[PDB]
Design a protein around this ligand. Structure first.
Ligand SMILES: [Mg+2]
Ligand SMILES: [Mg+2]
Ligand SMILES: [Mg+2]
Ligand SMILES: [Mg+2]
Ligand SMILES: [Mg+2]
Ligand SMILES: [Mg+2]
Ligand SMILES: [Mg+2]
Ligand SMILES: [Mg+2]
Ligand SMILES: [Mg+2]
Ligand SMILES: [Mg+2]
Ligand SMILES: [Mg+2]
Ligand SMILES: [Mg+2]
Ligand SMILES: [Mg+2]
Ligand SMILES: [Mg+2]
Ligand SMILES: [Mg+2]
Ligand SMILES: [Mg+2]
Ligand SMILES: [Mg+2]
Ligand SMILES: [Mg+2]
Ligand SMILES: [Mg+2]
Ligand SMILES: [Mg+2]
Ligand SMILES: [Mg+2]
Ligand SMILES: [Mg+2]
Ligand SMILES: [Mg+2]
Ligand SMILES: [Mg+2]
Ligand SMILES: [Mg+2]
Ligand SMILES: [Mg+2]
Ligand SMILES: [Mg+2]
Ligand SMILES: [Mg+2]
Ligand SMILES: [Mg+2]
Ligand SMILES: [Mg+2]
Ligand SMILES: [Mg+2]
Ligand SMILES: [Mg+2]
Ligand SMILES: [Mg+2]
Ligand SMILES: [Mg+2]
Ligand SMILES: [Mg+2]
Ligand SMILES: [Mg+2]
Ligand SMILES: [Mg+2]
Ligand SMILES: [Mg+2]
Ligand SMILES: [Mg+2]
Ligand SMILES: [Mg+2]
Ligand SMILES: [Mg+2]
Ligand SMILES: [Mg+2]
Ligand SMILES: [Mg+2]
Ligand SMILES: [Mg+2]
Ligand SMILES: [Mg+2]
Ligand SMILES: [Mg+2]
Ligand SMILES: [Mg+2]
Ligand SMILES: [Mg+2]
Ligand SMILES: [Mg+2]
Ligand SMILES: [Mg+2]
Ligand SMILES: [Mg+2]
Ligand SMILES: [Mg+2]
Ligand SMILES: [Mg+2]
Ligand SMILES: [Mg+2]
Ligand SMILES: [Mg+2]
Ligand SMILES: [Mg+2]
Ligand SMILES: [Mg+2]
Ligand SMILES: [Mg+2]
Ligand SMILES: [Mg+2]
Ligand SMILES: [Mg+2]
Ligand SMILES: [Mg+2]
Ligand SMILES: [Mg+2]
Ligand SMILES: [Mg+2]
Ligand SMILES: [Mg+2]
Ligand SMILES: [Mg+2]
Ligand SMILES: [Mg+2]
Ligand SMILES: [Mg+2]
Ligand SMILES: [Mg+2]
Ligand SMILES: [Mg+2]
Ligand SMILES: [Mg+2]
Ligand SMILES: [Mg+2]
Ligand SMILES: [Mg+2]
Ligand SMILES: [Mg+2]
Ligand SMILES: [Mg+2]
Ligand SMILES: [Mg+2]
Ligand SMILES: [Mg+2]
Ligand SMILES: [Mg+2]
Ligand SMILES: [Mg+2]
Ligand SMILES: [Mg+2]
Ligand SMILES: [Mg+2]
Ligand SMILES: [Mg+2]
Ligand SMILES: [Mg+2]
Ligand SMILES: [Mg+2]
Ligand SMILES: [Mg+2]
Ligand SMILES: [Mg+2]
Ligand SMILES: [Mg+2]
Ligand SMILES: [Mg+2]
Ligand SMILES: [Mg+2]
Ligand SMILES: [Mg+2]
Ligand SMILES: [Mg+2]
Ligand SMILES: [Mg+2]
Ligand SMILES: [Mg+2]
Ligand SMILES: [Mg+2]
Ligand SMILES: [Mg+2]
Ligand SMILES: [Mg+2]
Ligand SMILES: [Mg+2]
Ligand SMILES: [Mg+2]
Ligand SMILES: [Mg+2]
Ligand SMILES: [Mg+2]
Ligand SMILES: [Mg+2]
Ligand SMILES: [Mg+2]
Ligand SMILES: [Mg+2]
Ligand SMILES: [Mg+2]
Ligand SMILES: [Mg+2]
Ligand SMILES: [Mg+2]
Ligand SMILES: [Mg+2]
Lengths: 134, 77, 96, 101
RNA sequence: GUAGAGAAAAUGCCUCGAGCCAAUGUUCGAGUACCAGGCGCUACGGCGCUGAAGUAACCGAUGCCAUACUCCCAGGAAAAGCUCGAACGACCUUCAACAAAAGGGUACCUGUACCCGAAACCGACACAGGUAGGUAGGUAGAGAAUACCUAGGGGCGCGA
RNA sequence: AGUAACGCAAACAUUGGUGAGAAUCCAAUGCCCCGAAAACCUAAGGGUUCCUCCGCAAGGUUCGUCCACGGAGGGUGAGUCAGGGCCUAAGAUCAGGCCGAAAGGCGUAGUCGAUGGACAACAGGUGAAUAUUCCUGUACUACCCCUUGUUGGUCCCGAGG
RNA sequence: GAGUUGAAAAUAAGCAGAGAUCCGGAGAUUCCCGAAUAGGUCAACCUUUCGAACUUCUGCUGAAUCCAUGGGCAGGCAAGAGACAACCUGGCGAACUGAAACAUCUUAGUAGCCAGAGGAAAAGAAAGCAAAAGCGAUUCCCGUAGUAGCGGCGAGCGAAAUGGGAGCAGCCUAAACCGUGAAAACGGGGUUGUGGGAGAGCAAUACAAGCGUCGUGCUGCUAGGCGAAUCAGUGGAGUGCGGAACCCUAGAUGGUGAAAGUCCAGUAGCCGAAAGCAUCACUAGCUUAUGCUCUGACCCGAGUAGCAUGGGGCACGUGGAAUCCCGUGUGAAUCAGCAAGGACCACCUUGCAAGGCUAAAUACUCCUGGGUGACCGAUAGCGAAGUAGUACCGUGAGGGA
């Protein structure tokens, strides 16, 4: 499968080298580049080696699956393919605008993310607990 | 080895030359003897190999001076 | 005279690695009342006899070791005639 | 929060208690190894939990020994000693429940 | 048994002993073992069931006694276990050690498959070759030669 | 050049079977060859080639349903058999010791070193692949345990063997 | 600061905002082989009375032999031992080759081999250069100079002083003498050269300078964080094109479906260290210290210098052959001396051998971190962009895709 040189880069201690990227899992984003350009969605899975994200209704690909179990029954399934994290911008549903993202400090002793075209804060205090229970 | 303990002499590396000028590797050796020497302060002999210059120096300065400069204990000898 | 040194220094809890369950072993249980255990290579017979005699609380007749071509010691433990094999078979989860 | 708890618990015990504890744990580890091969359902996570628990225990043990002022060589001698005197006892955990049954 | 510095030994003197040796043989082991056949099933591969007689003579080893003899010159390993034993030295000592005939108990590692007059080792090959040792049936034959056979194994990895 | 060759002049034959496919794989019946081996076993070596199920790309001088080939899963059980826990030969290393520009060379006690000394097990059965190893019979070594009998035993040393 | 349990999916279970996985500092564990080190061995095993063998260390014990030596016993986290590309020092030390042959000479004190230590090593504080004028330890670069010379006067080899730079740094000890002993030792004194010190008297005394546990200090390194500015159209995808905008203490770089200052990670700029490391300052303390006069009687590194021989090395091949260093043998002088100044002698000048130690400038790349490249782009670049020192070949050293 994997082209032998396209495998995961490594540190001396054998662990893969992760790209640090600007988005988390529960986020809503809009897609700037690609054929999926303009569409809005929310993020499902994220791979921190390739730096690629997967979004539920976007980048659908038609995959043939052969299930041979005592009969021959095939399936035509539509899956979602990863799309590069640098093709998406964080989207504000409220003023309905996609922006870049800065960091800011909250008086709680906290560090969070905000959109710089509004000043709307992104991260909610229980966000992780909101997604874990899903 | 061919060495004197006391004066620390070495064999010396020297050419034998001919009348025809043709040089040759050769060794000149320390003149060594197996001597018993008298040690007065131990009231006894000591068996050694010695250069003869050592023997001289032992006549001149006494055995203990020589051995102490050379760091060799006459008891362990 | 002195403390009895065990042939090597091992840690007994690691020596019996596992029961070997295949068609072969099970009928050895049936016939011979003998369990089959993959054990540490560095481990001996006296150590296996104490280990299993204390662990499952059974008196053991005789032990026979083996070394696979893969370097993994394999031990036949044939128990006494008193303690049935199939007993320990249901106790361990080996089902004849 | 289990790690911190368990360590506080550990650092407060005595030496003999630690030893004994260690032994019991290693035995449970054994019985676990038996279940794996028996193909009786169990928890993969358990090997990790236990093995690492043992780690933590030994760590603490050696750490105290360092304060006592003992070297590597003395350590390893007393270790051969203690591994010599080890006798297997059946794991209190699951073997005692087949002694009762 | 004695004698010499002399326990045992060696050596010298005295004494007691007619038997001794060892393959093999008899008996137990050993029979409700094994086995010709017989009965029944056939997944027709193999299987369950019951079992008669089980002695004698003549050939005869290169094997055994056997380092047994006889002869020869070229004159044919060491050390431990083993048997015996005072002085010297060291260490250990009483329910401790040693000595015995029964009885019960107890049981260290490593090899172990397969091939090995070879398609598996050694020859670059699934190569007309090399490779220590053991076992040695029948008829003819002086014979381990030869010819034809048993047990067992094969019909040579291109055919027509 | 679709040429030489296909590795002895022991020899194959037919009927079935499996299979998409058989001169070549399986079985039966004949015939033929070896039989001081072309038989059975063990040393060394090889290293999983052994057994079962699947496969037929490459390997196999043709074929191929087959294989010492490829894939998966198994298989080697010892107080007595062979080595080690015993002893030494040739030879090796060699404390101290002797010598040597250095590395090292010689060499004593010691310690290694079997192809030799010492030392205890056989019959039958099971058996996809192990058996003097597993099972049933009778055995035998070495330790420990008790009873009894003695009081010194152990090593170093002296000897017979 | 959010998801995670290597490459590496899948499955099974966990661990996780009371902070996981992850990154950095300090510790812990570390089977068996290997210096290998309890004894043995056919490396990765065996046997064991469980032992770091042996050599140094501390203690107890005490052969032949009185003191001793040797040996025995014990203590001890116990000093060493091994590994290490090139560079370096020391030891052994070639030959092909050049000379159009070859032997002196050259190659070359090169390679190789052995031993040794360091981040550099070695050398180094004038018994030195020079020439009648002067310098002021060593090393390295430029130059003098292919000059003086050496040489079967053939092949060839080949300086130095003046001059310019880099870089700078000077110190301990022996002896006379005074203390303690029977010694051998220990303690003070004492270290220099157009002479010093010991000896005998009289003055000055406080600053200066050098070394350094402990510790907040300063800085840097080892994790990090904050970080400006864009939209739509164009045929798979736009960073390109046409058209509009903006940032810049940031237009380094890598990625992104297609070439991006403005999409991502970043860059400038600016913040950050509980722990360890490093250079620096400070740091109690420890060190030292001057001045003059008289005295040729006392010292100033002995089997040494030199001499005779045999060599070696110095650019210098025995030459008129100094200086330097060694075998054999002889063998001085102490400052009214001794050595050097290219045989040797006189005179003058310069210096003080036979005891040590010392940083920098210089050499190097198995490497680490940054940077650049008129460097390669799968026959190239490392032998190796996949099992690469692998497969395979060789008894082995070794070869090697
Ligand atoms: Mg692919
Ligand atoms: Mg079996
Ligand atoms: Mg182990
Ligand atoms: Mg075995
Ligand atoms: Mg006698
Ligand atoms: Mg007598
Ligand atoms: Mg007699
Ligand atoms: Mg007869
Ligand atoms: Mg004969
Ligand atoms: Mg024969
Ligand atoms: Mg005879
Ligand atoms: Mg006695
Ligand atoms: Mg007796
Ligand atoms: Mg077998
Ligand atoms: Mg066999
Ligand atoms: Mg063939
Ligand atoms: Mg052949
Ligand atoms: Mg053959
Ligand atoms: Mg015959
Ligand atoms: Mg005839
Ligand atoms: Mg006949
Ligand atoms: Mg014949
Ligand atoms: Mg036949
Ligand atoms: Mg034909
Ligand atoms: Mg052609
Ligand atoms: Mg033709
Ligand atoms: Mg023709
Ligand atoms: Mg033809
Ligand atoms: Mg041919
Ligand atoms: Mg053929
Ligand atoms: Mg025939
Ligand atoms: Mg055959
Ligand atoms: Mg066979
Ligand atoms: Mg064999
Ligand atoms: Mg294979
Ligand atoms: Mg087969
Ligand atoms: Mg094929
Ligand atoms: Mg074919
Ligand atoms: Mg078929
Ligand atoms: Mg196969
Ligand atoms: Mg010998
Ligand atoms: Mg030797
Ligand atoms: Mg020696
Ligand atoms: Mg010897
Ligand atoms: Mg041996
Ligand atoms: Mg033998
Ligand atoms: Mg035997
Ligand atoms: Mg034996
Ligand atoms: Mg077989
Ligand atoms: Mg049998
Ligand atoms: Mg048996
Ligand atoms: Mg029987
Ligand atoms: Mg017996
Ligand atoms: Mg004897
Ligand atoms: Mg580690
Ligand atoms: Mg060892
Ligand atoms: Mg060794
Ligand atoms: Mg004493
Ligand atoms: Mg005495
Ligand atoms: Mg002594
Ligand atoms: Mg000691
Ligand atoms: Mg070293
Ligand atoms: Mg070395
Ligand atoms: Mg080093
Ligand atoms: Mg020449
Ligand atoms: Mg020549
Ligand atoms: Mg020439
Ligand atoms: Mg020429
Ligand atoms: Mg430097
Ligand atoms: Mg130096
Ligand atoms: Mg100076
Ligand atoms: Mg000076
Ligand atoms: Mg200059
Ligand atoms: Mg300057
Ligand atoms: Mg200067
Ligand atoms: Mg002083
Ligand atoms: Mg002067
Ligand atoms: Mg003067
Ligand atoms: Mg004075
Ligand atoms: Mg940022
Ligand atoms: Mg930005
Ligand atoms: Mg655009
Ligand atoms: Mg544009
Ligand atoms: Mg993009
Ligand atoms: Mg894109
Ligand atoms: Mg760019
Ligand atoms: Mg920066
Ligand atoms: Mg004077
Ligand atoms: Mg001289
Ligand atoms: Mg003369
Ligand atoms: Mg001279
Ligand atoms: Mg010369
Ligand atoms: Mg000269
Ligand atoms: Mg001079
Ligand atoms: Mg000069
Ligand atoms: Mg001179
Ligand atoms: Mg010299
Ligand atoms: Mg003088
Ligand atoms: Mg001078
Ligand atoms: Mg002087
Ligand atoms: Mg001189
Ligand atoms: Mg000097
Ligand atoms: Mg020096
Ligand atoms: Mg290519
Ligand atoms: Mg290449
Ligand atoms: Mg190409």
């Amino acid at each position: 499968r994997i082209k032998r040189w396209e495998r995961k880069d490594c540190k001396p201690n054998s662990l893969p080298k992760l790209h640090k990227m600007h988005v988390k899992v529960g986020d809503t984003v809009k897609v700037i580049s690609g054929g999926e350009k303009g569409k809005i969605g929310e993020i499902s899975k994220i791979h921190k080696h390739n730096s690629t994200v997967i979004i539920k209704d976007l980048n659908l690909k038609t995959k043939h699956v052969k299930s041979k179990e005592e009969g021959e029954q095939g399936q035509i399934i539509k899956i979602e393919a990863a799309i590069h994290s640098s093709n998406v911008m964080l989207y504000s549903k409220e003023q309905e605008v996609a922006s870049r993202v800065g960091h800011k400090i909250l008086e709680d002793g906290r560090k969070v993310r905000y959109l710089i075209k509004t000043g709307e804060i992104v991260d909610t205090p229980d966000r992780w607990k909101e997604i874990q229970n899903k | 080895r061919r060495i004197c303990p006391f004066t620390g002499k070495k064999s010396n590396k020297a050419n034998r030359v001919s009348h025809s000028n043709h040089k040759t590797k050769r060794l000149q050796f320390v003149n060594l003897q197996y001597k018993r020497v008298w040690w007065e302060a131990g009231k006894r002999f000591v068996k050694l190999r010695l250069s003869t210059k050592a023997l001289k120096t032992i006549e001149k300065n006494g055995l203990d001076a020589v051995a102490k400069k050379a760091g060799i204990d006459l008891r362990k000898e | 005279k002195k403390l009895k040194y065990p042939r090597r220094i091992l840690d007994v809890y690691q020596i019996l690695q596992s029961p070997i369950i295949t068609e072969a072993a099970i009928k050895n249980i049936a016939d011979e009342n003998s369990l089959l255990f993959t054990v540490d290579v560095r481990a001996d017979k006296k150590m296996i006899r104490e280990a299993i005699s204390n662990f499952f609380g059974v008196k053991v007749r005789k032990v026979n070791t083996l070394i696979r071509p893969d370097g993994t010691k394999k031990a036949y433990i044939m128990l006494n005639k008193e303690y049935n094999a199939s007993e320990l078979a249901k106790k361990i989860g080996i089902f004849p | 929060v289990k790690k911190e708890d368990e360590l506080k618990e550990l650092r407060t015990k005595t030496n003999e208690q630690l030893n004994e504890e260690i032994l019991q744990l290693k035995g449970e580890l054994f019985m676990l190894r038996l279940q794996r091969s028996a193909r009786e359902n169990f928890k993969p996570s358990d090997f990790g939990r236990m093995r690492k628990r043992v780690a933590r225990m030994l760590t603490v043990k050696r750490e105290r020994e360092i304060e006592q002022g003992v070297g590597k060589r003395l350590s390893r001698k007393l270790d051969k000693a203690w591994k010599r005197s080890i006798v297997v006892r059946p794991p209190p955990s699951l073997k005692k429940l087949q002694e009762k049954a």
